[PDB]
Amino acid sequence: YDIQAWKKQCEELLNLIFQCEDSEPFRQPVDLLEYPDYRDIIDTPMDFATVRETLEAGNYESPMELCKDVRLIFSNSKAYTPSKRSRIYSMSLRLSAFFEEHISSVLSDYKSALRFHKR
């Protein structure tokens, strides 16, 4: 019932994501020189370094907020992809499945801890 445990759990999960080859296109903001029309389609860029920095700055209040920003990385890749078969989009799908598989217990434990706190 540790209400703060999610933060280190998210740091460790981000470490695993940064080790995944599939995260390379998503570690830093999308390069506008390589994809000049990016901001015409994507309103809110997001990347894993921004997520990690936000977490480390103490600017997430809950793992739900972190999860919303990670999911935005994946929805931006889906919105920008020219094809559902593209290389970068396929990497995003594998990374999303890995992230969802690991974030589920983090969210469950946090929500359970809050409910215990307010019992």
Ligand X SMILES: O=C(O)c1ccc(Cl)c(Cl)c1
Closest approach, Cβ 78 to ligand X, in A, equals 7
Site for ligand X in 91-110 (CB under 6 A): 92
CB nearer ligand X, residue 79 or residue 114: 79
DSSP 22-90: GGGGGSS---TTTSTTHHHH-SS---HHHHHHHHHTT--SSHHHHHHHHHHHHHHHHHH-S-TT-HHHH
Stretch that binds ligand X, among 54-62, 82-90, 101-109, 110-118 (CB under 6 A): 82-90
Residues that bind ligand X (CB under 6 A): 30, 35, 77, 80-82, 86, 88-89, 92
